[PDB]
Structure 1
């Protein structure tokens, strides 16, 4: 039963880590999109 609860904690952590990895990966995707937006924002000011 102790190996059991130990394994259970390992699994829950294994998944929690996968989640943080997923979230940081996603954050990068949004930053890149936002950079394209800022570039267009500058072009707009140049057009002004």
Structure 2
């Protein structure tokens, strides 16, 4: 049973990890698009 508990903790902790990672990956994937927006609005300052 001790091996049981410590393993359950390994798994909770594992999925928790892959969550944190998956999030950061998404954060990049978004900051790309938001960056491109910011560029184009600079272009709209050119047009003005």
Same fold (TM over 0.5): yes
Q: Is there any run of 5+ residues in structure 1 with no aligned partner, and where? A: none
Question: CA–CA distance in 2 between the matches of 1:8 and 1:32?
Answer: 37
- 1:1-48 alignment runs, 5 A limit: 1-48=1-48
Question: CA–CA distance in 2 between the matches of 1:42 and 1:31?
Answer: 16
Question: CA–CA distance in 2 between the matches of 1:35 and 1:10?
Answer: 37
TM-score (norm 2): 0.97
TM-score (norm 1): 0.97
Segments of 4+ in structure 1 off by > 3 A? none
State the superposition RMSD in angstroms: 0.4
Can you list the C-alpha shifts for 1:6-43, whole angstroms capped at 9, x where unaligned? 00000100100000000000000110001110010000
Question: CA–CA distance in 1 between the matches of 2:6 and 2:39?
Answer: 50
